[PDB]
């Protein structure tokens, strides 16, 4: 029983739906997440919708409020779970 | 005496109501929380309303802005308190 | 000279007014805070308006976005300052 | 070239303008900041518009979302930079 | 397939577009970012649109919600990636 059932889910709102992501590498994600909760620290590579990609030296349990289209598997050493 | 009494409580707003959660395991929570304050670090498993679940390797005092329907007891080693 | 003087102060907005809290124990706070900045790490107990209370094993300098009515003195080892 | 040029700058919005603060001690700040980025960890004292002041045992790189009128120099050991 | 495609991207919203920044030093950035994700810890210098600049002793993986016009190369030891 949620008292916030009638409330709309914005981008700023907490994570309603979560799904673990795989480093898919040139196949885009099913749904692009609002944020990424990292499970294991390391490096992971992220691509925008505009196509430019950088490597993120991420830590262990950080949330990073980025909205990626595709996570590639070349430099990805870090496992994450998407939030949406 | 709150000066913010007339203000509406959104999802982005601070925690008005808190209740400790138990790892219920196939019985859903009474009220689903806006966020989870973790008490003791460890692992805990969380299920959405869509049913998919992942394990979260959470730390000690982190808040995680996820909105879970049910916390299962299979892989839950971490005690948390819900915020709503 | 604030350029944000005409802006309304919501719950999501930064801390305008701060006051140090004492673990009052069955006398409610003067004004309930939007958030609590902790000064010294430890444990502290917090009561809602609905009456249920839990112990929070809080760390040293964390802010916790909870909106408590009364901070009791039974299990409170941690000093905090309220934000409003 | 900002794509967010037409957007209004709220209190919740990121830091547009930054200026380093000095512990002025009974002369108020030029502009009161939305938040304080701390440069060097230590203690610093902050006064509201209502006049009450507390000491904050702050850490090194923390941002603290407080909106102070004057930073005094009595107990201030920590250097910070204001955000607005 | 984003379910938040129709939603507008505010300043408070997560990072849609990311690009790595270079310490350009008296040539302004192409697009000013909403936030800066730091890659390697150190010091970096940031200039507003009003022109005043300070040095930030930043840590390794921190996001700092500042909106800089130009990152100079005099005191910049830290590599960052912009978010927008």
């Amino acid at each position: 029983m949620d008292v916030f059932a009638k409330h709309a889910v914005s981008l700023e709102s907490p994570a309603v739906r979560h799904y673990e992501i795989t480093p898919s590498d040139s196949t885009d994600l099913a749904r692009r997440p609002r944020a990424l909760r990292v499970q294991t620290g390391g490096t992971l590579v992220l691509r925008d919708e505009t196509g430019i990609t950088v490597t993120y030296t991420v830590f262990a349990g950080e949330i990073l409020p980025v909205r990626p289209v595709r996570v590639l598997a070349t430099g990805t050493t870090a496992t994450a779970v998407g939030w949406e | 005496m709150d000066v913010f009494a007339k203000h509406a409580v959104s999802l982005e707003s601070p925690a008005v109501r808190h209740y400790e959660i138990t790892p219920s395991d196939s019985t859903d929570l009474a009220r689903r929380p806006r966020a989870l304050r973790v008490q003791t670090g460890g692992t805990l498993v969380l299920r959405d309303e869509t049913g998919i679940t992942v394990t979260y390797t959470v730390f000690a005092g982190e808040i995680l802005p996820v909105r879970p329907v049910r916390v299962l007891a299979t892989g839950t080693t971490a005690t948390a308190v819900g915020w709503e | 000279m604030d350029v944000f003087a005409k802006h309304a102060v919501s719950l999501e907005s930064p801390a305008v007014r701060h006051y140090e809290i004492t673990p009052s124990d069955s006398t409610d706070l003067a004004r309930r805070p939007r958030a609590l900045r902790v000064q010294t790490g430890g444990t502290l107990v917090l009561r809602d308006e609905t009456g249920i209370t839990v112990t929070y094993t809080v760390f040293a300098g964390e802010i916790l976005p909870v909106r408590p009515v009364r901070v009791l003195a039974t299990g409170t080892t941690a000093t905090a300052v309220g934000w409003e | 070239m900002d794509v967010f040029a037409k957007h209004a700058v709220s209190l919740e919005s990121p830091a547009v303008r930054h200026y380093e603060i000095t512990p002025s001690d009974s002369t108020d700040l030029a502009r009161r900041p939305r938040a304080l980025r701390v440069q060097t960890g230590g203690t610093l004292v902050l006064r509201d518009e209502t006049g009450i002041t507390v000491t904050y045992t702050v850490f090194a790189g923390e941002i603290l979302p407080v909106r102070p009128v004057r930073v005094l120099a009595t107990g201030t050991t920590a250097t910070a930079v204001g955000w607005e | 397939m984003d379910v938040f495609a129709k939603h507008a991207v505010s300043l408070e919203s997560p990072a849609v577009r990311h690009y790595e920044i270079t310490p350009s030093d008296s040539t302004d950035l192409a697009r000013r970012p909403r936030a800066l994700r730091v890659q390697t810890g150190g010091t970096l210098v940031l200039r507003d649109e009003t022109g005043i600049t300070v040095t930030y002793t930043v840590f390794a993986g921190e996001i700092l919600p500042v909106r800089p016009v130009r990152v100079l190369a005099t005191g910049t030891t830290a590599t960052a990636v912009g978010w927008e």
């Binding site: 700023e12 949330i63 | 925690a15 | - | 830091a15 941002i63 | 909403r34």
Partner: peptide, 10 residues
């Protein structure tokens, strides 16, 4: 920046 619980940028 401020006191929300929101997974957000600022």
């Amino acid at each position: 920046i401020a006191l929300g619980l929101g997974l957000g940028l600022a």
